[PDB]
Amino acid sequence: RTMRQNLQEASDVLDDQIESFTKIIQNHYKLSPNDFADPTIQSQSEIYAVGRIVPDSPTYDKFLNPESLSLETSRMGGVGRRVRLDLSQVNELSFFLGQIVAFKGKNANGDYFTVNSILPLPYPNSPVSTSQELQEFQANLEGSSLKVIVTCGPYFANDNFSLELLQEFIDSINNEVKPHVLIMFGPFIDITHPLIASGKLPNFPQFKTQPKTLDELFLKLFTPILKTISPHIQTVLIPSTKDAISNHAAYPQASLIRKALQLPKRNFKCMANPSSFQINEIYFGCSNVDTFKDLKEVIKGGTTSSRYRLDRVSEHILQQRRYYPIFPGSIRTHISGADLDVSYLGLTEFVGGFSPDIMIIPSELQHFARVVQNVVVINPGRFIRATGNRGSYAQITVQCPDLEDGKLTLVEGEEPVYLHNVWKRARVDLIAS
Amino acid sequence: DVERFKDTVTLELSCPSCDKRFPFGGIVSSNYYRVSYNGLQCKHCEQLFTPLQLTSQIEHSIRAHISLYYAGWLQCDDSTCGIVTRQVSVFGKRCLNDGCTGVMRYKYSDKQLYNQLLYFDSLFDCEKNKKQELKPIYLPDDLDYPKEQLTESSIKALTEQNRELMETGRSVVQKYLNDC
Ligand SMILES: [Zn+2]
Ligand SMILES: [Zn+2]
């Protein structure tokens, strides 16, 4: 796929989000489509409605509140019309721009839709495994626990090109920690690094031939150090749209090309941003746009506000079934941004409709690991800080799966399968790098 | 090519030693820089750019443009409305002003982006530099209009002397042009 932006196609995708949630709501709550009607017009009767949270003016103030939101309907639902929301009868809520929501309410007089109740979107199902599969996974590990290390760029500071800290880290994982898998998120060479941005790039006396491009700078600076990661540790690279080495600077972002990075096949895999995969039974959902920094909630209610922001935001992501549900995506003001390629938001949805067991969405906020709705949510933090001080990384240690220990749940059915209960078996440490 | 680049914007380079900023128009006259026989040279402090010092900036500008493009600003046709917004109606072309009949269009069209990249490409195109077919960086009334004009034969010679630099600068644009 090329750099094309097509308005009809983008709008198709936004329409389809509303329609697919309309079907999820109808199946979960067992409602008939005749119970759904157009909230943008007057009725005498209470109706159910599904739509997208949008601002009530298209040229809107940076700071929204519960009196300045509208609901956008699908093309079939309300000819795409948008209607102002009256949220005065609802004491507890958290909304954000781009959120798909379901309401019970009424447009009494034509110009407002009064929300009487919020129908919460249901959490997606968790993946399951057969007893045979779990036994193989048990044999893979030879008793011992599964170890996965996760890092996120930047890897060098703002005022130099030192990877000394990364070398120290590599020595540690090779010779002490010895994990099974290492997941490394970009940026590797961040195009917005201030020396890169300004072109203040020095002569490197430790290179025989100077790089002429940022791609060559990666081959001379990162490749030789990455090559020293033990071949026994499988290493996964996931890019950022700020990666100078990527030529696909929109989310969702195609994977890097490993051969081009001159990294060895023996232990390096390049994955897309986002990507979903299993390590043994554990489903990972990885995405490298900063949802946790960017999602700006409009909030009412003491109970909602007393909760932790990171819990609320993780639940919004699980409910929305996409790793960056904010739309329009955030902008850094022009320098950088989410850079959403709206036509392909499809690929940023939860693969198979499954919630991940572990969800990793690096952020510039402080590192954190939290269980929310039985999903382990991890922000490993930046590997190095801009000043050159130690950053952090995440270590995930998961007890080896055991059908006999009880910690796996048998799901009832003719075909016997088990919920991984990764949250019950996983320990996440956030370690100074 | 003339009309194609009429609305593109200049590639602005910053000098690694002294930080003076200037538009780069190819192997053409300028009061700020000189393409000498050993490379691109800053006229304020005489320091030579290395290739990485040039190409990192080319790439940075490209990516700034590509990021602006993905911000997805839209604009309305109707001269009596004109709103710019990033909101997209589920009917994409439809304007979000109550009752406005204008058509919405991406404000950074993909034609404009492609033209912007083709302009950058032209700057490092040897054949175009030699034939003197690049777009001028300065209008005649600009206070920075160049004081000395380069000769054709200087441009030919200087272009062949800097072929390698040009081609490497050009490859950085092509990284994104084949991807478009
Ligand atoms: Zn200078
Ligand atoms: Zn309009």
Q: Which phi and psi (to 5°) does residue A237 adopt? A: -110, 130
Q: How far is the C-alpha of A249 from the C-alpha of A288, rounded, in Å?
A: 12
Q: Does the beta-carbon distance from A191 to B59 stay under 8 Å?
A: yes
Candidate from B16, B105, B114 with C-beta closest to A200: B16
Would strands A336-337 and A331-332 be described as parallel, antiparallel, or unpaired? Answer: antiparallel
Instruction: Write out the E strands in A303-385.
Output: 331-332, 336-337, 358-360, 368-372, 375-379
The CATH number that applies at residue B172 is 1.10.3200.20
The number of folded domains in chain B is: 1
Task: Give the residue extent of every domain in chain A.
Answer: 1-125+290-355, 126-289+356-433
Tell me if A349 sits within 8 A of A119, measured CB to CB: no
Q: If you measure CA to CA, which chain A residue comes closest to B117? A: A3
Across the A/B interface, how many CB contacts are shorter than 8 Å? 148
| Token couple for B90 | 């589920």
Tell me if A107 sits within 8 A of A41, measured CB to CB: yes
**Taking the mean position of all CA atoms in its chain, how far away is CA A184?**
15
What is the residue type of B38?
N
- Range of the structural domain that residue B85 is part of: 1-180
Instruction: Give the mutation candidate from A7, A40, A246 for the B interface (greatest B CB count, under 10 A).
Output: A7
In a 10 Å sphere around its CB, with 0-12 CB exposed, 13-18 middle and 19+ buried, how is residue A421 labelled?
middle
Q: Contacts of residue A211 in chain B, CB cutoff 8 Å? A: 52
Q: Which phi and psi (to 5°) does residue A416 adopt? A: -75, 120
Ligand number with the minimum distance to the CA of B76: 2
Q: How far is the C-alpha of B84 from the C-alpha of B64, rounded, in Å?
A: 20
Q: Does the beta-carbon distance from A201 to B64 stay under 8 Å?
A: no
Q: How far is the C-alpha of A423 from the C-alpha of A404, rounded, in Å?
A: 18
Q: If you measure CA to CA, which chain A residue comes closest to B170? A: A213
Centre a 10 Å sphere on the Cβ of residue B79 and count the other Cβ atoms it contains.
Answer: 7
Show which of residues 80-139 on chain B sit within 8 Å of chain A, judged by CB atoms. 83-94, 96-97, 104-106, 110, 113-114
Q: If you measure CA to CA, which chain B residue comes closest to A193? A: B60
Q: Does the beta-carbon distance from B87 to A55 stay under 8 Å?
A: yes
Q: Does the beta-carbon distance from A247 to B16 stay under 8 Å?
A: no
Give the contacts of A116 (CB within 8 A, at least 6 positions apart): A46, A89, A90, A103, A104, A105, A106
To the nearest whole angstrom, how far is the Cα of B129 from the nearest Cα of chain A?
Answer: 21
Q: How far is the C-alpha of A81 from the C-alpha of A103, rounded, in Å?
A: 16
Structure solved via:
X-ray
Closest CA to A348 of A370, A317, A377: A317
Residues with Cβ within 5 Å of ion ligand 2? Answer: B 76, 78, 81, 95, 97, 100, 102
B76 CA distance to ligand 2 middle (Å): 5
Q: How far is the C-alpha of A100 from the C-alpha of A349, rounded, in Å?
A: 13
Tell me if A290 sits within 8 A of A308, measured CB to CB: no
**Taking the mean position of all CA atoms in its chain, how far away is CA A92?**
25
Data resolution in angstroms = 2.5
To the nearest whole angstrom, how far is the Cα of A256 from the nearest Cα of chain B?
Answer: 14
Q: If you measure CA to CA, which chain B residue comes closest to A15? A: B90
| Token couple for A377 | 């949510």
To the nearest whole angstrom, how far is the Cα of A403 from the nearest Cα of chain B?
Answer: 48
To the nearest whole angstrom, how far is the Cα of A81 from the nearest Cα of chain B?
Answer: 8
Q: Tell the CATH topology of A126-289+356-433.
A: Purple Acid Phosphatase; chain A, domain 2 (3.60.21)
Q: Does the beta-carbon distance from B89 to A72 stay under 8 Å?
A: yes
Peptide linkage before A328 cis (omega within 30 of 0): yes
Candidate from A82, A191, A199 with C-beta closest to B14: A199
In a 10 Å sphere around its CB, with 0-12 CB exposed, 13-18 middle and 19+ buried, how is residue B99 labelled?
exposed
A190 CA distance to ligand 1 middle (Å): 25
Bridge-partner residues for A179, per DSSP?
none
